[PDB]
Design a binder for this molecule. Structure first.
Ligand code: QFK
Length: 267
């Protein structure tokens, strides 16, 4: 869990930055050296994220090397060189439809594992997916993540905070209730963003106007070039009723079959 600071080499230029803090590129001496992504600061929220990540073991989840306490608290991760999914698709609009299906199905696989593990992500969005290659996606940013209690299928938040409302299910807004089903809702928004090549959902709308629109039964339209079947799944993830909304096991199966169907059609 705890890493030796002298084994860590940090690069001067910041790889990434945001309201969360900063991301720096580094090297961790393990016989070989390991290229790492280091998240810098709050201490309770960083240790809590590390505690969640330590318990996770999946190919479609960013791996935590460990934590380091120096000048600031550091979350040391395995490097995904291509960065955030939304920023990548924005910079590469020539990425084929099949490649978008491949990447969102990988996210559904990591989320399926996360659901089986009774963990709620609570910040599933394209900005929080990282690319190892153009054909390899991993879920990151576990700072709002909660291990569900043995007796409950949801996490109840005690009062409001800094929340990405455009990704949140109506029950998250109306009852402060976060489940794997509510992560399914965020995933539908994530699908929309990927098929819109990193475009922001609910363009020019306030958080409250988005709540008003969803309550009326209105949903985001089909992105240009997005297949019928993927927009149907998007709308299914956007089922207002938590009970009738599918879980990741069913969302991953629809994506898995659709991907192989596109793969077959290709050759
Ligand atoms: C905000 N900008 C970036 O993160 C970023 N920008 C560029 C150009 N990158 C290149 C590689 C990379 N790798 C990489 N690997 C493993 C983990 C991470 N984490 C990044 C976050 C932060 N979260 C909001 C996304 C959490 N983990 N990041 C990241 C970035």
């Amino acid at each position: 869990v705890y890493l030796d600071r002298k084994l860590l080499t940090l690069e001067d230029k910041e790889l990434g930055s945001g309201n969360f803090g900063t991301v720096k590129k580094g090297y961790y001496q393990m016989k070989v050296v390991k290229t790492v992504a280091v998240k810098i600061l709050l201490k309770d929220e960083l240790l809590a994220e590390a505690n969640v990540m330590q318990q996770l073991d999946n190919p479609y989840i960013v791996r935590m090397i460990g934590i380091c306490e120096a000048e600031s608290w550091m979350l040391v991760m395995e490097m995904a060189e291509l960065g955030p999914l939304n920023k990548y698709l924005q910079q590469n609009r020539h990425v084929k439809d099949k490649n978008i299906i491949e990447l969102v199905h990988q996210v559904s696989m990591g989320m399926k594992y996360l659901e089986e593990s009774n963990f709620v992500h609570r910040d599933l969005a394209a900005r929080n997916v990282l690319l190892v290659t153009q054909h390899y996606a991993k879920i990151s940013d576990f700072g709002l993540s909660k291990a569900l209690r043995a007796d409950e299928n949801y996490y109840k938040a005690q009062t409001h905070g800094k929340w990405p409302v455009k990704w949140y299910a109506p029950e998250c807004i109306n009852y402060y209730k976060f489940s794997s089903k509510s992560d399914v809702w965020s995933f539908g928004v994530l699908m929309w963003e990927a098929f819109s090549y990193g475009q922001k959902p609910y363009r020019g709308m306030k958080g409250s106007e988005v709540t008003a629109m969803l309550e009326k039964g209105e949903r985001m339209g089909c992105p240009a070039g997005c297949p019928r079947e993927m927009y149907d799944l998007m709308n299914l993830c956007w089922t207002y009723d938590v009970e009738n909304r599918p879980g990741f096991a069913a969302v991953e199966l629809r994506l898995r079959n659709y991907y192989y169907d596109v793969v077959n059609h290709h050759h």
